[PDB]
Amino acid sequence: HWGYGKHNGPEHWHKDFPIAKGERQSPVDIDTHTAKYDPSLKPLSVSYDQATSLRILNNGHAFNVEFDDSQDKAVLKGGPLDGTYRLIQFHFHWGSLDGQGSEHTVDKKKYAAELHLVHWNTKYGDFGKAVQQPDGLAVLGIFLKVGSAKPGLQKVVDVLDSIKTKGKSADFTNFDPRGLLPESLDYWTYPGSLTTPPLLECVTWIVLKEPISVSSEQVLKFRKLNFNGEGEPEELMVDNWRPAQPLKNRQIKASFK
Ligand SMILES: CC#CCNS(=O)(=O)c1cc(S(N)(=O)=O)ccc1C(=O)O
Ligand SMILES: [Zn+2]
């Protein structure tokens, strides 16, 4: 099936998912000089005080921290968005070395990792219906650089030993995703897609300008995870990122000057 290897990686995905070569694919390089400041963009509204995390899952491609999205608890609004988007999960993409890992790039710079907080538009009633709509999802992307530790990430890091392999999950309640945010909510935004199969063109991307810092030890623990299931030959879960795709007929807008 699809993955991140030589034989099943991003360059192969178009055979099962022809939208891979579509008109609004993600990620993209963010050329900072070409992104236009848009004074009509609003501040982003991140309301995560009532977030209810439930579980952490190794899905064979990344690990997902899952939230209760059965009511408006943790929501994203404002910014480029119309209406209300509910947090369903977060996950990361990362590298085998600190010089690569992010999906978005900034003037061709790759960060060590990238956090994605996935939200769906409540006007469509459920996630599955939302992914069929061009404005169905809003994904908040946050770059990770290696430096000082991120205290709010350590609870995530410490549970990873319990979900080493594909299909393992663990209870993961009372995690506060506010502890993964940078100080500034300045952002770039553009219309795009999921970065994994099925690659659906249903996402408004919101990529924060300010990276968070995590420690070398924190990201090292991400790279001890496995793509494989229990008892199968060990394939370290590293380099689970799709490279930048053609921008085509899109404009990246900045919320800041
Ligand atoms: C049908 C369908 C779908 C997409 N699911 S997701 O939005 O949770 C998601 C989103 C993304 S990303 N990188 O596009 O935000 C990656 C991975 C996943 C996932 O299934 O775990
Ligand atoms: Zn992602």
Swiss-Prot record:
Changing T196S: Enhanced p-nitrophenyl acetate esterase activity, but normal CO(2) hydrase activity. It is linked to Osteopetrosis, autosomal recessive 3: A rare genetic disease characterized by abnormally dense bone, due to defective resorption of immature bone. Osteopetrosis occurs in two forms: a severe autosomal recessive form occurring in utero, infancy, or childhood, and a benign autosomal dominant form occurring in adolescence or adulthood. Recessive osteopetrosis commonly manifests in early infancy with macrocephaly, feeding difficulties, evolving blindness and deafness, bone marrow failure, severe anemia, and hepatosplenomegaly. InterPro entries: CA_dom, CA_dom_sf, Carbonic_anhydrase_a-class, Carbonic_anhydrase_a-class_CS. The gene is CA2. GO terms for cellular component: apical part of cell; cytoplasm; cytosol; extracellular exosome; myelin sheath; plasma membrane. SUPFAM superfamilies: Carbonic anhydrase. The active site is at H61 (proton donor/acceptor). Zn(2+) binds at H91, H93, H116. Changing G141R: In OPTB3; complete loss of activity. Changing V139 to F/Y: Strongly impaired activity. GO terms for biological process: angiotensin-activated signaling pathway; carbon dioxide transport; morphogenesis of an epithelium; neuron cellular homeostasis; positive regulation of cellular pH reduction; positive regulation of dipeptide transmembrane transport; positive regulation of synaptic transmission, GABAergic; regulation of chloride transport. GO terms for molecular function: arylesterase activity; carbonate dehydratase activity; cyanamide hydratase activity; zinc ion binding. Changing W2A: Impaired activity, not rescued by 4-methylimidazole (4-MI). It is an enzyme of class 4 (lyase). Changing H91Y: In OPTB3; partial loss of activity. This is Carbonic anhydrase 2. Changing V139G: Weakly impaired activity. The modification Phosphoserine is found at S162, S169.
